[PDB]
Ligand binder design. Structure first.
Ligand SMILES: Nc1ncnc2c1ncn2[C@@H]1O[C@H](COP(=O)(O)OP(=O)(O)OP(O)(O)=S)[C@@H](O)[C@H]1O
Ligand SMILES: [Mg+2]
Length: 163
DNA sequence: TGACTGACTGACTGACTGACTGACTGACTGACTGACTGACTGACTGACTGACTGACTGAC
């Protein structure tokens, strides 16, 4: 079809979703839509996870392109706040800034959302203790035994990456 | 039935780390660097040596 929807991928239900490359397949907007559908039909909070703090413009770069595809429901963009049908459930999450994470109470999020996972020829100033950072986040949110999933996508097929 | 608001707020900067790149270099080393005891034996030598001269008798 045109834009594959990842439900068949989600069928296996392992938490780690290693999707690689796929420039322009619509995994970006599928992983935008999916938590919105989950919050609408069940009531699960969602958090758009990036790596750094300085990006604030992603108030509108995440949510506009997927706002219209929903036919008959209401959406509100309030900066770091995301509202679906007048219910506040979405916020941006920086990884470089970890400390604000350790103060913030965890919203109940079924699946963490993340594409552009790989760094291609960056300045190499990524997050130190990177795999340890992801482990610390996973322990931090849902310290109970309730299961939590994660979706992570890389721009290009880098066969080996730190995780 | 309302009119600034005082404390949350987008944001939009204002100062600062390291990572990576752009030449030194002085550190390090290797390929000369011309000497310097050894070989040794090419040339040199006294040390050591075996057969011709030297004739009054064996013989007369
Ligand atoms: N719900 C949707 N409604 C409309 N178009 C969609 C939807 N989901 C995906 N797409 C399409 O998906 C295409 C690819 O856009 P992205 O979602 O950014 O792809 P992407 O797969 O994240 O690329 P990568 O892998 O991150 S480099 C766009 O042209 C959209 O039209
Ligand atoms: Mg993407």
């Amino acid at each position: 079809s045109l834009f594959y929807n990842p439900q068949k991928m989600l069928s296996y239900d392992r938490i780690l979703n290693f999707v690689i490359g796929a420039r322009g397949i619509g995994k970006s907007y599928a992983m935008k839509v999916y938590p919105i559908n989950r919050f609408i039909k069940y009531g699960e909070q969602f958090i758009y996870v990036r790596r750094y703090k300085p990006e604030l413009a992603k108030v509108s770069n995440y949510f506009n392109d997927v706002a219209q595809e929903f036919p008959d429901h209401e959406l509100v963009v309030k900066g770091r706040r995301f509202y679906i049908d007048g219910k506040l459930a979405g916020w941006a999450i920086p990884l470089s800034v970890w400390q604000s994470e350790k103060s913030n109470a965890y919203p109940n999020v079924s699946t963490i959302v993340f594409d552009e996972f790989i760094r291609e020829k960056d300045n190499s100033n990524y997050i130190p203790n990177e795999v340890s950072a992801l482990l610390n986040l996973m322990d931090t949110v849902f310290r109970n035994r309730e299961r939590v999933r994660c979706i992570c996508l890389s721009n290009a097929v880098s066969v080996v990456n730190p995780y």
